[PDB]
Every structure is written in C-alpha cells, then in structure tokens.
C-alpha cells in the first residue's frame, strides 16, 4: 500500500491493457489471413466430391471398404487443437464433448483410438490418460498437407486392416466472427451425400487404367483433404476465439484501472493529512 | 426522526473542534467524534410501561 | 453583490464564477495566513461553509433569480478530493465539454453522455 | 542475544519523550531515536585477543 505502490500497479495495468489490445488487433488481421486460406480450399473437395459420387452412386457401383458398415468394435478419432492458449474455452468445449462421446463409446465396449493435430490436445489427452496412437504438432498457422499425411496414414491403413470400423474428426467450425462450435462429424465410412443417380446415365468415364483402382485412390485423396479442411476451419475460429478473448480481458483490465484509481486516491488523501497533521501537531 | 445528513453534522463539528485547536485524529475528526454520534443514536430507544409510569408520574399506564 | 442588485430589480440574472476552484485555494492561502489548523487534505477548517455562505446567496426568489454558469477543476482528477466533493452537492446541473466531439467539428462539443441535470 | 521487537523499545521510548514535551519528528518518535538503536547495537562486537588480554589483565591469553 502507499500512494506509489498502487501508482506502479496502475502503470502495470495499463500496460496489460496495451498489450492485449495489439493482441486483439493481431488476432484480427490473421483470422481475415484464415478465412481466406479457408475459402481457396473448397473447389478440390467438392470436385472431388462428385467424382466420388459419380464412381459410388451413379449408374454402377463397388464393393469398397470405406463406403458401407460394419460391426463397430472399435473407433478413431481425429482431433484437432490449437497451438497456442489464450483463445478461451476453445480447446476444453472440443475435449469435454469429445470425452462424453468417448465414455458412450467405452459403455458400449469398444475402445477408442486418438490420432492429435496440435500440441494442447496432445498435452491434455496425455494426462487425461486417452489412447494416443500418432500425432503431428507445431504447425502453427503455416499448415499443410504434406504434414497431415502421417497421421491420417496411420487411421485409413488401421482402418482398412480392418482394426478401426468408424472414424470421426473433431473440430471446430467457423460459423460466424462471433460464434464457432465443436462438431463431431463422421468421415469414414463415406456420409450418404444429398446426390442422385438420375443424373448420371448422361455420360460414363473412360477409365484409365480401371475405376477399382483409381476410387482407392480418390477416397483416399478425399479423407486428407477433409482433415486438411477440418484443420484450417479449426485455425480460423482459433483467430477468432483470441480476438474476443483479448477484447474481454481489456475491458476487464480497464475495469479494474478504476478500482486501483478509488484506492490510490483515498491513499494520497491519506498521506497527505497524516504528514501536515504531524507537523501542525508538533509546533508548540 | 430522520437526521438528513449526519455527514454534515460531524464535519460541523470537525470545523468547531479544529477552531478551538484540539489535536485531530484519522480524517482529521477529532478524537470524540464517535462519541458525538453515539449520545445522540442511543436516544432513539424503546421505553418499557414502568419507564413510562415513573416518568409520567402515573398519569400513563400500561404503554411503552 | 452585483447580481443580487440586478435581481432586486426583478430581473433574471446570469452569474459567471470563471474557477470555484481558485476560490476554495483563496479561502485555504487566507486561512494559513490566519494560522488555523490545517482539516482533512490541508483544506481549510472552514470549506463547507466558505462554500455555502457562497452558494447560497444565489437562488430563485419571489421577485427576481440568480443562474450561475460555474467553470469546475478537479484536482488530480479526483472527485472524491474535498473541494470537488464539496462543490458537488451544490450544482444542479452538469455540462462536460470534449475535445473529441470538437474534432469531428461539431459545435458545442457538449457530450450528451457524461452531461447531466437532475 | 536476542532483542525481541526493538520496535517495542522504540515505543517505550517514545512515550517516554512525548511526556516529557520533547519535539515529535516523524511518526511522533523522537529526534534521536537512531542514536537510541545504534549505541546500542554498536556493542555486538568480536574483539582481538588483545582487547581481552587488556581487560582481563593478563588472566586470560590469545582468545578472541
């Protein structure tokens, strides 16, 4: 206490207040940067898509492991996390919703398998004790498909060794500037999309070498891209969950800017009256 | 009774104690400006019935 | 003394004090010079009523009325200082002008939030 | 040896100066207050064999 111990407590406060606010701006520039990035990565999925409809659903179709059910004994998931805190609940929405998810899995009997994008999820599902079975890490905000192919590797070819029977991805989803929300989606095996067959009997591909071999391919080449996707929509409402976040805790450092004024103030006062006190008092 | 502001009371009385030069206290108040409130609130009582009797020389029965 | 000739006139009168502030400061240099003890921020013994024998002489009466226009300083920005603290409960009304909305050339920079009247 | 709290010997003292009107200086303690600890601290020595042999006359030798 004193006058000037709370005096140098305001000047550290205001500093707080300054450099949340560059954080806020920062957060700000990147999540525009994000959404960008977020947006030149439609086209190849959807195309991708078609084709993939086109192969599956049009006028004939194939017996491939990744497109009916089977026997859940066992699930994968791919999980999505941020590398870098002070985004607010971001990351602890994600876990606890998957973690329930989880624990109706295990009820049921069938394990789960945990593959980590992001070093927060890996620290957290390491001392929550998960099944963590591959991960990458450190991509920040330069992601790229060249790093994600490890992991999902790892998932498809334990998928179709028969060793997974679902997997899911676990993300955010940047909804709007002011709200993004954890989903849960299925990926494999492949979603019924809202497509029909009618419209296929127009034309047929010459396949080059045989459609059994290339629809490998391109499921293969789709899962990656909707991790790829999953992860830079996580990236963007990262951005945005910082900028909002920053903007809280200035409004709270200026709030309390004025509660160390009402004590500084009422300390000054203080000093003053006890000092010309002690003066007046001792003469004569 | 309603005393409308006792802020102004004790800052009147702080004026005539620091005119007389008596040696102030925290805020400046004197040193009996606890006391100045206190005689004056602890008259606001309620009286039980021989109290009234006694002072009322037996003229009121019965009442507080 | 002026204004009240004037109101006695029956008018109504408009009273300009150019810094109460500097009047409270007058009051606390004389008292020092007089040697009372110094009150509760080393402001006189007597504000409140330095103040009021002031404040009080200007209001509405049955033939005539004082407004008074009061420029106000708040020392340290403190309106918990003595001074301020004192002078407060004696306005009515409160303008506070802006640089900000002077900037954007609007006149008068009157800033209808922090402005106020009861 | 062991003061415990000379900032109770400060207070003792300064009773002791108050009533006898000597001038306050800051928080009321008197001026000399400081020659009160230090004189007394200042005792707290480690004196050479010499200093002993001196004020033992000779009955005690080479011990600090």
Do not use: C
């Amino acid at each position: 206490a004193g006058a000037k111990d709370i005096r140098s407590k305001i000047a550290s406060v205001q500093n707080t207040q300054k450099i949340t606010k560059a954080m806020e701006m920062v957060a700000a520039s990147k999540m525009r940067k994000s959404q960008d990035r977020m947006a030149a990565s439609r086209p190849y999925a959807e195309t991708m898509r078609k084709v993939i409809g086109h192969l599956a659903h049009g006028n004939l179709e194939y017996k491939h492991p990744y497109l009916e059910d089977r026997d859940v004994k066992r699930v994968g998931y791919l999980v999505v996390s941020t590398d870098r805190g002070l985004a607010g609940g971001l990351n602890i929405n994600l876990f606890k919703k998957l973690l329930a998810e989880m624990k109706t899995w295990t009820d049921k009997g069938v394990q789960a398998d945990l593959a980590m994008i992001g070093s927060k999820g890996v620290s957290f599902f390491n001392s929550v004790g998960g099944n963590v079975v591959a991960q990458v890490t450190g991509m920040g905000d330069n992601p790229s498909l060249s790093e994600l192919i490890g992991p999902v590797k790892v998932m498809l070819q334990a998928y179709d060794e028969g060793r997974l029977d679902k997997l899911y991805i676990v993300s955010n989803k940047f909804i709007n500037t002011m709200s993004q929300v954890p989903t849960i989606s299925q990926l494999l095996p492949l979603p019924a999309s809202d497509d029909d067959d009618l419209k296929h009997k127009s034309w047929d591909y010459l396949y080059e070498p045989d459609p059994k071999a290339l629809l490998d391919t391109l499921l293969r080449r789709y899962v990656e891209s909707q991790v790829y996707q999953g992860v830079v929509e996580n990236l963007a409402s990262e951005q945005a969950a910082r900028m909002v976040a920053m903007k809280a805790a200035t409004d709270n450092g200026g709030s309390l800017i004025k509660e160390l004024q009402l004590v500084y103030n009422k300390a000054r006062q203080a000093s003053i009256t006890q000092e010309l006190t002690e003066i007046v008092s001792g003469a004569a | 009774i309603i005393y409308d502001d006792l802020s102004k009371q004790a800052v009147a009385y702080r004026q005539i104690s620091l005119l007389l030069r008596r040696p102030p206290g925290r805020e400046a108040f004197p040193g009996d400006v606890f006391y100045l409130h206190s005689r004056l609130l602890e008259r606001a009582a309620r009286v039980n019935a021989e109290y009234v009797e006694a002072f009322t020389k037996g003229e009121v029965k019965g009442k507080t | 003394t002026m204004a009240e000739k004037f109101r006695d006139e029956g008018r109504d009168v408009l009273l300009f004090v150019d810094n109460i502030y500097r009047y409270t400061l007058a009051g606390t240099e004389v008292s020092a010079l007089l040697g009372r003890m110094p009150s509760a921020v080393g402001y006189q013994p007597t504000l409140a009523e330095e103040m009021g024998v002031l404040q009080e002489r200007i209001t509405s009466t049955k033939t005539g009325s004082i407004t008074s226009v009061q420029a106000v300083y708040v020392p340290a920005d403190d309106l918990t200082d003595p001074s301020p603290a004192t002078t407060f409960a004696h306005l009515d009304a409160t303008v506070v002008l802006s640089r900000q909305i002077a900037s954007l050339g609007i006149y008068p920079a009157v800033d209808p939030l922090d402005s106020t009247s009861r």
